[PDB]
């Protein structure tokens, strides 16, 4: 049923239990969702490259997960673990408080404009937030909120 449905779509958003189980909502699988408009000629190379960069650091983490499951993190190189830290931040920055979900989160929904999304995710992949804590990225809107959460986490 679902297998024959993929062929009739222009955009597929695949939800995963493994991700839902982590408290990551919406539980969208970033390595199993696609769109036929995800093309630099349609959305611009900025949009295309950031999306592509996000997927690359996540697939690299996923390939890394098996190693750390045995050795822990200590055995990784400074670069190997710098991707682990950004990957987990990016995974968290993908989560979002839904307005429809207020009855579950006890928090006000958020809506993030496209330009703000691309910018924000670009900066994290570039390393411009390697000093902020993971929790700052979890359940927020734009990258300003991440910085502001980190501030409200200080005190």
């Amino acid at each position: 049923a679902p297998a024959t449905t993929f062929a009739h779509l222009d955009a597929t958003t695949v939800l995963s239990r493994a991700i839902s189980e982590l408290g990551i909502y919406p539980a969208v699988d970033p390595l199993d969702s696609n769109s036929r408009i995800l093309d630099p000629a349609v959305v611009g190379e900025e949009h295309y490259q950031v999306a592509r960069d996000v997927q690359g650091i996540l697939q690299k983490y996923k390939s890394l997960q098996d190693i750390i499951a045995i050795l822990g993190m200590d055995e990784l190189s400074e670069e190997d673990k710098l991707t682990v830290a950004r990957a987990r931040k990016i995974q968290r920055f993908l989560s979002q408080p839904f307005d429809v979900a207020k009855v579950f989160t006890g928090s006000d929904g958020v809506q993030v404009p496209l330009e703000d999304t691309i910018k924000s995710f670009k900066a994290v992949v570039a390393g411009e937030y390697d000093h902020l804590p993971e929790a700052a990225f979890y359940m927020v809107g734009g990258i300003e909120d991440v910085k502001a959460k980190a501030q409200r986490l200080a005190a």
Partner: peptide, 19 residues
Amino acid sequence: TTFDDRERAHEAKFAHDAE
């Protein structure tokens, strides 16, 4: 994985020590 437990316990730990 196989050690899905150690896997998560480790990530969670070293994320805690980061924060």
